[PDB]
């Protein structure tokens, strides 16, 4: 019989991309942020493929699929970054890629320290709660489904049912490992706090995107997403789904 949803989430999880960061040239903040955005664009492409393979996702209207990915790309990438940093270094360093870790000479670069602290926060929550792989996979799906327009979606019905599916799945992963309800509480608190941790990252992203002087480069993928997303965030027409 048919493979479990959880086993499917494992097979569709993208492989970690390499950055090609040349730690041979001198470390500058503009160059590091540019490299991170390049790697970001590629990871997002990877996430579109992943979302497409996601049972249920293709049943949403194309506008809604686009909306969800637009609003949650930053949280998807920050969540995986937290995961890799947890597995690869127990949350001691940011592990962006096998060829790109943030050491103390590049954490001390202008603008870096604060953004890196916010990202390590995410990592250290995985450490605190000792999150399992399966918990992580289900939570990552829920993140894709966590930020919606205040004016609702088109296929609201299909959307509500998709959320129910993956909440079930998180529940099952919790069952198959404190106490079930406490664990669910803690993990959905973690999801809720992602909105705050990531709001700050978005703010800095918008700043590096709009700042002419700074000359941080964005690939065209992200540039188009960010460019579109920015007016919606100013206008405050973006709603977090919170469990609490």
């Amino acid at each position: 019989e048919f493979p479990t949803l959880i086993s499917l989430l494992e097979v569709i999880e993208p492989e970690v991309l390499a950055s090609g960061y040349d730690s041979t040239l001198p470390d500058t903040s503009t160059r590091l942020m540019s490299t991170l955005n390049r790697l970001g664009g590629r990871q997002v492409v990877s996430a579109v493929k992943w979302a497409k393979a996601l049972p249920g996702f293709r049943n949403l209207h194309l506008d809604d699929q686009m909306t969800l990915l637009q609003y949650s790309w930053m949280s998807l990438m920050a969540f995986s970054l937290g995961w890799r940093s947890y597995k690869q270094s127990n949350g001691n360093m940011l592990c962006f890629a096998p060829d790109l870790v943030i050491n103390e000479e590049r954490m001390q670069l202008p603008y870096m320290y604060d953004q890196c602290q916010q990202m390590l926060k995410i990592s250290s929550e995985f450490v605190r709660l000792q999150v399992s792989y399966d918990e992580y996979l289900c939570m990552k799906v829920l993140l894709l489904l966590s930020t919606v327009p205040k004016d609702g979606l088109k296929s609201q019905a299909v959307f509500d049912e998709i959320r129910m599916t993956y909440i079930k799945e998180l529940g099952k992963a919790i069952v198959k490992r404190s106490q079930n309800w406490q664990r669910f509480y803690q993990l959905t608190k973690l999801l809720d706090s992602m909105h705050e941790m990531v709001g700050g990252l978005l703010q800095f992203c918008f700043y590096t995107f709009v700042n002419k002087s700074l000359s941080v480069e964005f690939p065209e993928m992200l540039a188009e997403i960010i460019s579109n997303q920015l007016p919606k965030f100013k206008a405050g027409s973006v709603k977090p789904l919170l469990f609490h």
Binding site: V45, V48, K49, K52, L62, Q65, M66, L69, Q70, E220, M221, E224, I225, S227, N228
Partner: peptide
């Protein structure tokens, strides 16, 4: 609307 994103979703 973000063209590369939309295209990515419409295709492969």
């Amino acid at each position: 609307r973000p063209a590369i994103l939309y295209a990515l979703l419409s295709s492969s």
